[PDB]
Inverse folding.
């Protein structure tokens, strides 16, 4: 067994043992996968976290906002995974929005320059990463991004929700391109998870009201979710992406998979 | 009669007698409205077109990308419409994407810098215009933007479709803010219309394939539309926005109104 046996998945995200990426990576590895990692800013730190993973995995720098990193991605991955080999999976657990477009700050009040690098890192990054790595994929490969239902306005999230709405719209376009390589591109829309930086926001982080608005949003969930919703266990979201990086969901691409306890489907 | 009798609607867009904005403005005026206009780049030209309108209307410069214009909008509109008066409507007939994110150019191939000012002008502009004018609206006012169903990938449009998906997501957030002023914000999703620059693209404009891909998309429509779809008559789209700027659609905000012959609802 090993759902993901002898597969090469490259994982994005992992910033702390709290990060979802981290949890996919573990579940992934127990499942027989073989990762290669991408780090962003504090590489030495990611490095140290990455060591508690059930298995060693090469880590590589990558600021999704720097061309030369992207220019050189593919080389690097091969160079590591070893030539004559290609990868079967790529996971985009990444996003970011500046103080302003999120939190307490009124909505109309975010600078388009701020709003922008959010879009640049949260949505557009999906395309860059795919155009860059699509050339090294075995057929029947999988590309996956982490989503958060932006289909109805919620409060406090503001422009991060707008950035996700774009994510949803970019994925459809990547599905089109990946199609030619016989590779799939999909989004897993998670329920709220207590990641670190989430934690910080439900604390005083972005504001008081902002915070109390999450708290509540966070509770609507478990209520609504017919099978409930644990905001502290990213394991169910990890096993889904794990289903998607696998060959058991072969006829589905442009798609979004609600890994949310059912919440999105119930009114109250 | 005069659906829009003694109402102050400020219209965005009008670049040629072909432009939709132009058509709303006419229908608007025959309906008893009283406009005030916004021009973008070639003001003298807009000016000359604007004269064939059934009625005189003050025109004002406004590059939705220049802060000081937005900073000074409200003053200008009052200054014109005359102090002690407020407007009941605002129409956002505006958008734009650089060669690259549209047309023949592959999707992965657009620079985020290009992709960006599209987003900046097409989506984000909706928010700026609203934060700026919301202070001068009578209650039960209306804000309307022009939409184009981005809910399924289409070809050739690329990033303009992504920009509209964001538009749809911004509107929901503006509905929230407009709510406090008791003003409404909605999107009219049009079918394809032969505007000038559209014309140019179905000609050789953006590319050959790009062009032949519109042509076809353009025909799927009238087929699909149970009551059909005339790509050369922007009158039905104009009368809808006209319904929406009016008090007959009072309980509906965050919304998108399909002004499309029914196309969006039928598979084949
Ligand atoms: N946590 C939630 O409640 C929730 C729910 C549904 C979806 N998601 C999405 O899941 C994804 C995973 O994020 P998370 O919540 O695990 O949080 P997280 O704080 O662990 O960080 C996600 C990452 O963004 C990275 N980042 C920012 N700029 C970058 C850049 N230039 N290059 C590379 N990485 C960069 C950080 O290094 C970090 O890894 C997020 O994108 C989030 O939108 C999250
Ligand atoms: N034509 C269609 O098939 C179609 C269909 C559905 C929706 N829409 C939308 O309808 C809206 C109306 O556009 P149209 O198709 O009538 O085309 P159009 O070419 O008449 O131009 C729309 C406008 O964008 C303006 N523009 C660009 N940058 C600007 C700036 N910085 N400041 C102010 N104006 C600026 C131009 O001046 C022009 O008026 C568009 O936004 C389009 O997305 C169009």
């Amino acid at each position: 067994a090993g759902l993901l046996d002898g597969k090469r998945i490259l994982v994005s995200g992992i910033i702390t043992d709290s990060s979802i990426a981290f949890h996919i990576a573990r579940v992934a590895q127990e499942q027989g996968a073989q990762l290669v990692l991408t780090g962003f800013d504090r590489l030495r730190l990611i490095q140290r976290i990455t060591d508690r993973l059930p298995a060693k995995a090469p880590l590589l720098e990558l600021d999704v906002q720097n061309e030369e990193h992207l220019a050189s991605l593919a080389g690097r991955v091969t160079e590591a995974i070893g030539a004559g080999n290609k990868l079967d999976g790529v996971v985009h657990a990444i996003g970011f929005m500046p103080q302003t477009g999120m939190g307490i700050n009124p909505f109309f009040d975010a600078p388009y320059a701020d709003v922008s690098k959010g879009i640049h890192i949260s949505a557009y990054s999906y395309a860059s990463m795919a155009k860059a790595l699509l050339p090294i994929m075995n057929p029947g490969g999988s590309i996956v991004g982490m989503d958060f239902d932006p289909s109805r306005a919620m409060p406090a999230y503001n422009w991060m929700t707008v950035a996700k709405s774009a994510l949803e719209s970019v994925n459809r376009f990547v599905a089109r391109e990946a199609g030619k390589y016989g590779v799939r591109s999909n989004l897993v829309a998670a329920g709220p998870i207590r990641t670190l930086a989430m934690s910080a926001i439900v604390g005083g982080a972005l504001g008081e009201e902002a915070g109390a608005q999450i708290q509540l949003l966070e509770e609507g969930w478990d209520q609504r979710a017919p099978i409930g919703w644990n905001m502290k266990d990213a394991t169910p979201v990890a096993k889904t992406v794990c289903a998607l990086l696998s060959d058991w969901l072969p006829a589905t691409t442009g798609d979004i998979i609600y890994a949310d306890g059912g919440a999105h489907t119930q009114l109250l």
Remarks:
- Chain A has one domain: 1-268.
- Residues 112-133 of chain A form the longest helix (22 residues).
